[PDB]
Write a protein that binds this ligand. Structure first.
Ligand SMILES: C[C@](O[C@@H]1CC(C(=O)O)=C[C@@H](OP(=O)(O)O)[C@H]1O)(OP(=O)(O)O)C(=O)O
Length: 427
């Protein structure tokens, strides 16, 4: 068991050029692979989730080249649905943005492919997506627990009337949206009830349009898609910096700045997590917006009580930032934290108490009352990059913190600790 100990950080200040967005990167790679023509992606993220998508594309026969730092990728589009037979196994780590989208996309035409991943991925739900794909004609088999990967895909999604549950993950709808345009028949996707993580759907539609396809969005309750379309290379495409990864650095400034500026995202970003900056502002920090940067400057930090369903990833960062705020913070409507890299409500509550907070772990919310002063803890990270990054903020205090399995940040941000160190100042 590897670990990293962070000594107290007296002040943070500086500029971070953000690693590429994981959400945009994996959507762009799959759309580029399906598209006609050569796509050149720049500012692509190099992290485990992207690497698993790249390996899957290699396995499927897609040709591409990567620059030395793996942030520039020249992809030769397949000009249509990807194919493989013989129950070829694609190992997808714990990448939801590879597992959910490929589970749908590979249902086009005939195929015989198995999708699997790390143990935790076999515990992340996918039944709502499988139900929807089957309504459209796909043949899908659960090889282990019903409603979870691994899956054996045998093709057959032709389109039609498809209902999909949007209450647990927006990724199921995302996967259907990217797939349906290439199906032979038109598809009408009806959302059953609620839709969580709605901003990620806007990221999907934005990327689909960049690749030549638009659909009819009826108030997010129903989506009308014309079949028989084709994705087309947009030529060179710049991947946005990752707004979820930015959250740690902006929160660091709100706690212990200084001014921290992150570049690669700005007021025009398509990512929902730039709204994390509005939460810091509500807590008392000062935010500056640019075309290609967001900056945060220390002001004060007051507790808040907010529904965080629109920024589930960055919301975790408020849970540790809350340790430094005045008052009790409550984060609501975040049930799906439970079905991600780990059950994040259980994990966040457990680790927060270790550094001294009094915490109520609600079924779909968390309430945090900070201690007068933090104490040292060895933080468990649950194979979850975000637990490691969130708890790194404990060091913006008088106490060091030890983070177990620090390399788990590689899921989306291999260089996280060096980047936090870059803005950490002793004076
Ligand atoms: C969970 C995480 O990020 C998810 C990425 C994502 C997307 O479509 O790009 C949508 C959200 O999932 P949901 O709709 O289920 O809330 C995010 O939480 O990772 P993932 O890609 O493995 O699912 C994360 O990085 O924290």
């Amino acid at each position: 068991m590897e670990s990293l100990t962070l000594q107290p950080i007296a002040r943070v200040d500086g500029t971070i050029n953000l690693p590429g967005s994981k959400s945009v990167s994996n959507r762009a790679l799959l759309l580029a692979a399906l598209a006609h023509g050569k796509t050149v992606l720049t500012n692509l993220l190099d992290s485990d989730d992207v690497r698993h998508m790249l390996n899957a594309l290699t396995a499927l026969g897609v040709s591409y080249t990567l620059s030395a730092d793996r942030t520039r990728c020249e992809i030769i589009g397949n000009g249509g649905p990807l194919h493989a037979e013989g129950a070829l196994e694609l190992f997808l780590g714990n990448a939801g943005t590879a597992m959910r989208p490929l589970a749908a996309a590979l249902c086009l035409g005939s195929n015989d492919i198995v999708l699997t991943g790390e143990p935790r991925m076999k515990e992340r739900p996918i039944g709502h997506l499988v139900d929807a794909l089957r309504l459209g004609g796909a043949k899908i088999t659960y090889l282990e627990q019903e409603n979870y990967p691994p899956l054996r895909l045998q093709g057959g999604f032709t389109g039609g009337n498809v209902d999909v549950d949007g209450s647990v993950s927006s990724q199921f709808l995302t996967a259907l949206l990217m797939t349906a345009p290439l199906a032979p028949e038109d598809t009408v996707i009806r959302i059953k009830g609620d839709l969580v993580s709605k901003p990620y759907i806007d990221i999907t539609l934005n990327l689909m349009k960049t690749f030549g396809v638009e659909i009819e969005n009826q108030h997010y309750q129903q989506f009308v898609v014309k079949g028989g379309q084709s994705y087309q290379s947009p030529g060179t495409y710049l991947v946005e910096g990752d707004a979820s990864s930015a959250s740690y650095f902006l929160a660091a400034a709100a706690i212990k700045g200084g001014t921290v500026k992150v570049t690669g995202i700005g007021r025009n970003s398509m990512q929902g997590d730039i709204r994390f900056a509005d939460v810091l502002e509500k807590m008392g920090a000062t935010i500056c917006w640019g075309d290609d940067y967001i900056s945060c400057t220390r002001g004060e930090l007051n507790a808040i009580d907010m529904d965080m369903n629109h920024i589930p990833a960055a919301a975790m960062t408020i849970a540790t930032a809350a340790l430094f705020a005045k008052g009790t913070t409550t984060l609501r409507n975040i049930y799906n934290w439970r079905v991600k890299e780990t059950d994040r409500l259980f994990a966040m509550a457990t680790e927060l108490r270790k550094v001294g907070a009094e915490v109520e772990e609600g079924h779909d919310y968390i309430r945090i009352t900070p201690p007068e002063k933090l104490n040292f803890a060895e933080i468990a990270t649950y194979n979850d990059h975000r637990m490691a990054m969130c708890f790194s903020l404990v060091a913006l205090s008088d106490t060091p913190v030890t983070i177990l399995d620090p390399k788990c940040t590689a899921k989306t941000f291999p260089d996280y600790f060096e980047q936090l160190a870059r803005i950490s100042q002793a004076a």
